[PDB]
Amino acid sequence: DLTLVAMRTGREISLPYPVSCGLTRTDALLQGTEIHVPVVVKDIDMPQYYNAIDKDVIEGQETVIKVKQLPPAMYPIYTYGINTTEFYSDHFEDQVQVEMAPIDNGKAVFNDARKFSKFMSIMRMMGNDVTATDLVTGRKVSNWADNSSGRFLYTDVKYEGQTAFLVDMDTVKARDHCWVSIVDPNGTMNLSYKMTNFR
Amino acid sequence: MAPIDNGKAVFNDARKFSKFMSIMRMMGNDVTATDLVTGRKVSNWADNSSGRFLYTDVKYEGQTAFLVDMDTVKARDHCWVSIVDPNGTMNLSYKMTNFR
Amino acid sequence: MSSLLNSLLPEYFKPKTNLNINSSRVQYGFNARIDMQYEDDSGTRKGSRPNAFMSNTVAFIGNYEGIIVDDIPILDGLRADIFDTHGDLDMGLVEDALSKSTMIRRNVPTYTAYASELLYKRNLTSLFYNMLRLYYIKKWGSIKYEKDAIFYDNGHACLLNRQLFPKSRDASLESSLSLPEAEIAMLDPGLEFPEEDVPAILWHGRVSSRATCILGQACSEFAPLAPFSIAHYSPQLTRKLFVNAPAGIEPSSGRYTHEDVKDAITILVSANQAYTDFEAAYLMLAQTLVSPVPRTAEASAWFINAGMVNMPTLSCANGYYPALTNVNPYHRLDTWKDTLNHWVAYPDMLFYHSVAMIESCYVELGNVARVSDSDAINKYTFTELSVQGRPVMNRGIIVDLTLVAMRTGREISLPYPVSCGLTRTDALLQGTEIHVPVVVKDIDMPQYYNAIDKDVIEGQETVIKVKQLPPAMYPIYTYGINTTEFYSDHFEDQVQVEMAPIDNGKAVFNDARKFSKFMSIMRMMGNDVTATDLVTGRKVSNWADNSSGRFLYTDVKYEGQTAFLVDMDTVKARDHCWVSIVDPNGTMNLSYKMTNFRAAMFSRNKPLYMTGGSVRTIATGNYRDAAERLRAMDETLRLKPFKITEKLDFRVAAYAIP
Amino acid sequence: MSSLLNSLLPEYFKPKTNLNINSSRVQYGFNARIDMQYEDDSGTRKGSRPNAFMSNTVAFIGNYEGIIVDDIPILDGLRADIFDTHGDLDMGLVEDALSKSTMIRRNVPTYTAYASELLYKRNLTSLFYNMLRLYYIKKWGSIKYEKDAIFYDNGHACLLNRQLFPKSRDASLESSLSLPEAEIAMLDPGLEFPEEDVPAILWHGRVSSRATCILGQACSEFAPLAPFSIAHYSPQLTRKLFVNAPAGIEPSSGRYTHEDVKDAITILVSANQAYTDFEAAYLMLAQTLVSPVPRTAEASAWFINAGMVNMPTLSCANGYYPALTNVNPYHRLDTWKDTLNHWVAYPDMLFYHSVAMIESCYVELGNVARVSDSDAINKYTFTELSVQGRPVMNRGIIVDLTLVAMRTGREISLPYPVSCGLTRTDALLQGTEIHVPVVVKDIDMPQYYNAIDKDVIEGQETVIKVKQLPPAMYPIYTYGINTTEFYSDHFEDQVQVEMAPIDNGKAVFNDARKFSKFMSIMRMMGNDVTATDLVTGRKVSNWADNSSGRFLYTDVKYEGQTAFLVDMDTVKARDHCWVSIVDPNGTMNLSYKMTNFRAAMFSRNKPLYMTGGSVRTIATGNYRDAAERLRAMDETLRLKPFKITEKLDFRVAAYAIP
Secondary structure, eight states: OHHHHHHHHTSOEEESSOOOOSOOOTTHHHHOSOEEEEEEOSSSOOTTTSOBSOSSOOTTOEEEEEEOSOOOSSOOSTTSSSSOOTTTTOOSEEEEEEOOOTTSOSEEEEOOSHHHHHHHHHHHHTTEEOEEEESSSOOEEESOOOSSSOOOOGGGGOOOSOOOEEEETTSOEEOSSSOOOOSSOOSOEEEEEEOOOOO | OOOBSSSEEEEOSHHHHHHHHHHHHHHTEEOEEEETTTOOEEESOSOSSSOOOOGGGGOOOSOOOEEEESSSOEESSOOSSOOSOOOSSOOOOOOOOOOO | OHHHHHHTSOTTOOOOSBOOOOSSEEEEEEEEEEOOEEEOSSOEEEOOEEEEEEEEEEESOOOEEEEEEOOOOOOOSSBSSSBOSSSOBOHHHHHHHHHHTOSOOTTHHHHHHHHHHHTTSOBOHHHHHHHHHHHHHHHTTTOEEOTTSEEEEOSSEEEESSSSOOSOOOEEHHHHOOOOOOBOOBOOTTOOSOOTTOOEEEOSSSOOHHHHHHHHHHHSOBOOSSOOGGGOBBOOOOSBOEEEOSSOOOOOOSOOOHHHHHHHHHHHHHHHTOHHHHHHHHHHHHHHSOEEOOSSGGGGGGGSSOEEEEEEOOBOBTTTOTTSSOSSBOOSSSOOSHHHHHHHHOGGGHHHHHHHHHHHHHHHHHHHTTBOSSSSSOTTSSHHHHBOSOOSSSOTHHHHHHHHHHHHTSOEEESSOOOOEEOOTTSSSSOSOEEEEEEEOSTTHHHHSOBSOSSOOTTOEEEEEESSOOOSOOOSTTSSSSOOTTTOOOSEEEEEEEOOOOSSSEEEEOSHHHHHHHHHHHHHHTEEOEEEETTTOOEEESOSOSSSOOOOGGGGOOOSOOOEEEESSSOEESSOOSSOOSOOOSEEEEEEEEEOOOEEEESSSSBOOOBBOOOOOOOOOSOSSOOSOOOOOSSSEEEOOOEEOOOTTSSSBOEEOO | OHHHHHHTSOSSOOOEEEOOOOSSEEEEEEEEEEOOEEEOSSOOEEOOEEEEEEEEEEESBOOEEEEEEOOOOOOBTBBSSSBOSSSSBOTTHHHHHHHSSSSOTTTHHHHHHHHHHHTTOEEOHHHHHHHHHHHHHHHSTTOEEOSSOEEEEOSSEEEEHHHHOOSOOOEESTTTOOOOOOEEEEOOTTOSSOOTTSOEEEOSSBOOHHHHHHHHHHTSOBOOSSOBSSSOBBOOOOSEEEEEOSBOOOOOOSOOOHHHHHHHHHHHHHHHTOSHHHHHHHHHHHHSSOEEOOSSGGGGGGGSSOEEEEEEOOEEBSSSOGGGOOSSBOOSSSOOSHHHHHHHHOGGGHHHHHHHHHHHHHHHHHHHTTSOSSSSSOSSSSHHHHOOSOOSSSOTHHHHHHHHHHHHTSOOOOSSOOOOEEOOTTHHHHOSOEEEEEEESSSOOTTTSOBSOSSOOTTOEEEEEEOSOOOSSOOSTTSSSSOOTTTTOOSEEEEEEOOOTTSOSEEEEOOSHHHHHHHHHHHHTTEEOEEEESSSOOEEESOOOSSSOOOOGGGGOOOSOOOEEEETTSOEEOSSSOOOOSSOOSOEEEEEEEEEEEEEEEETTEEOOOEEEEOOOOOSHHHHHHHHHTTOSOOOEEEOOOOEEOOTTOSSOEEOOO
């Protein structure tokens, strides 16, 4: 636990005695096997999003989700922009440039995985419900997959494969309050934000 | 060359796809790919008269990703250069002489 | 040792990750372009072979037997403090190390006494060997062995799988073995006296239901039905195996996927710090995995008698004393985790490393067989002069790595002098003619082969005599890295020979070297010439091997001195380029160039294509944060190469120190 | 002393830790390349044996009998304060030391009075000796002894195990002894007056359940059934043994392994500070671990009567005076812990140290038996002039160490002049005829051997009269380090036999020296020569051994005038790899050359290989440099970080060191 803190802050932690007592967290990681978490369903269109065991499930049924790679359990908040990585993208200033031509009728394909993550994340700050669909596999991902942090990490796809995300920009829905509207875009889009003060 | 997973190679970029099918045509390999957005089959052997591949043979303005069928690569016209299984970075250098 | 066997592959070839093997036979070669130029007294002629396929054939069939022997301990993974200023294990410091890392100090005198006896016999190489074999049985578990199939087939003679492998039946690779399960018990902490002749191993967290079944079957006896390379007979490793797991082990499931065996190996190595033990097992499997299909019928003499695989005894004392294994391990080389990191990333790469190793051994044994038994370096005393360490016995891997050094001409070095694996030089080290059983296909068989019965009928089972062992394989991957006169595997070469006077329709070739050069030219032009050996009275043919398009002098099948009567009237035209002429006149000059190499693999008379992505390099430098190279070149194994010095005889080979 | 016995081993010999002995007979030796030559007026005939095996057979059987004798006290261990300037117990500082301690005040005056007698009872050599024998009995317990087995056989004469050892039943070494346990009582600290004639020892913490069983059996009578060397007859050391352990003595377990005996020794030496006592016990066992199988039939005279082992009486008064032993002991030599530290690390090395000592002794007693009594340094007075100390009696280890000093040609130094162990020079000093029994095979025996009967039918039990004792072992480990002309153990040697054509093969050797070299070199060449003495009329054969393959002059079995007729048309070729003497004419010149040496061991007519780690030369400095180091790295858990680094993919993470 102390060696993980040393990696986060980026400093040298020193104790007087090399004592080895307390909780061990790295248990499910080192096993390197599939884990079967139980879930009770609410809607009927669940198993498209989550990697479920059943393909058709009536509401109020107890199902199982197959988790292979462990997603992050917490988002950095106290350690925000002290030792920044491009995965979490916990910057004060950030921008993304999605390049579209008028010949394309709103439909954009993200060949790159990095800028797809930043586009889907900044659109959620702006209070827009985007629903992308993978062209190779045929699954779907939604940027609204959290009600705490309000960011989109790439591990919300729940699948490691080839990157071909079709996003249709005439099915974008305004969900939250205090939001900027994308009524009908034409040409190159440039999104950007700035966090100024903290309380 | 894109990684061949089962018997299919995904070409996400547009420029790289144009260069790939342009090489395989000069070698003389009738390759058939599936456009993932539309769901229609493209073929590099569209025009027989002029022995070249233009990107307009896809017949879809806009952005897409192609799934190339690497198992069903037919051998129409074979010179000694002609290979079926590409591996890594493909280099083709040709010279045209003796016009009449 | 990945970096060693990876170097053997040719510079042009870089193989991809995956390879879907779906048969018990794989051809491997290259498609080269030959530009020949002919000149004689009549005039000049220029041609060009546009596509020429030179290939060997390798199979998954080889009769092997396991023996449990006592070998050296691998002292890698133990804490660095117990070792003194030199590279030696001091029992004075083991007492101190165990004392400081406990509150209960009553048990220190007892713990030290048992530890001193067990540390000098620690070896997990035999456990990893069986775990690796279980991985490949599950992965390639759809390969069929038919009993009434062909082994070698030329046209005159034939060998079936009934012969060479009696006591065999028709079975798939998954159907070959029905392994039992050894008792995987839990070591409760509190037991004071370690039970003797039972090893104890560490584990990360809870032992999975699937991990139990793998460890149970890895320790059990292997009893095959069909002869397979990766399912050979092995004795029982242990009866029990303790596992010091804080969380209790689960009962055995019964079934496991090939993916589950990777998870079992990765945990077992990481916990025990047994990285060098894995490197031994990796090299040990590279020898066994594949076996050569013989070039000619005489080259079946190698694979009659069952070669012995020396498996080290399974012992480990990490479970009892987990204080000795800590966060600061002792290692001799800084590149000591490369072999595992290579395998876990690219499992199917072992096939290419195995083909590269067995080729290098069986090519160089072609030369060692021809060495006269009245020189400094001969078949008996070639290993002993080469090695510069202190192993238990010059057996197993030491013999194989000595032949790789002689091939490449570079100094090979391992951290520990391990003597574990297959010994090939058994048929070689005996002054006796070997009786290869064969089947007669054509009535004129006794004229070609040295048969017992001089009159035969199509269908009869006879026996042929082999005195000197011919080469089993031709250089393909190791083509032109160092060229001997025997093989003549040049890129560019100018062959010059003087044609003998054609009296009636026959040309007498009294000299041995001139005869070899003549039939070598006529083969490259593509003329099937047949000559009569005057001493024996048997017919030789340059078209002996179709796969590799070259002529070796061992195709005559007569050690000693002779004169050949070549039939110049009956020169058939099998393959004709524009260079190809039938009537040579005076001094024959042939100058050829080989360019445009490209690797190709064939399986079941169709092209076998490589799948997956491109292999990115994984490799660690000589220093991580180490200041001074403390040489420590006393215990380390070193193998010195020998260079072949050609002499006038041509039939005899001779080695010298470079 | 580990140091002096280590130097006796050859330079080419590189020993390993473990030696898996599974029999009661070992043929230790070396493989050498002999280049023999026979020059003559007709021409030269060259030979070459690439692997020539020169061996000395060593067994685990030998009749010995222990007797309890009075020996000097060993004062190493007691605190350095009580000693004066000269180095003897200054009584007055003892009374001062006891007064300023944690002793009961009413016991001080009565205990001080006894000190004059009890403090000079310090000799634990007998206890350590018995505890070392229990270690090797349980380790090599599976070795067998058959009653009707062949002790010696040379074709003509045979000597069975029934002949030398009557009252002998066939049994395994483990099943030989049935040791009864002596009482191990706890010493009451509040005892009125110390009980003399009852030894009291110290212990660290609690006496374990197994330590009671080991100490109980160590201080008991050895009454064996089979005549084994490490299970010979010993009297009862003591009836009762006190142990000053505040933590109570647990009752006897009954069973124990060989590892538990090492635990018992290491606690006993550390508590009592008795390292010099252990060094004496180590050298004692080195003599009487293995006995040599006789080279010739008439060399069995050494092992007819049982040689007495001198075990010093068990006497220790540390239990009564705990204050006088502390962490600052008095020692003469600085390297006083080296012998124990060597044994704890490498227990099985004692086998090599044992054969080195007996081979050194029995070689020198060979060429000591061939000196006339009328001389300065002779049979009776070779020990007195060499010894420059003050031992009680010239017996045990003093006689064996002085013979080693003569062999190697160096000065052997011990800290205390202790006189305990086996005495070998018994049959020599008697100077009388010895009657060895023999069972005959052929009917023409009594011409060769000096037998009691002149005509004896096959299968009869006869007697041979041995007057002068022949050498029991040939020098092998000490080959060409201190060469004498008797053994003729040179690397290069030659002999010139001068004959004229007028003589029809018949040569008479007037000289005795060159007759020995001729007969010896002819046996290397594999020729069976049979000479006949002209004066007496007896016969000698060069083939009188199947181990070394040399001819010593003591094989004549008679001292007289030298006139040996050898007929050189009755020479028969016996062995393989031999040069032929078909028909010689003129002067003969024989010669050989030994070039290289490789250590080899044989057991049950199979190769016995050394396994385990590489044995080093342990010095006092190599451990105490790690004490100087102390691991001075302040024991503070400093965790260093890793900065994550992003690259093209971004899906997978990569950590850097800085």
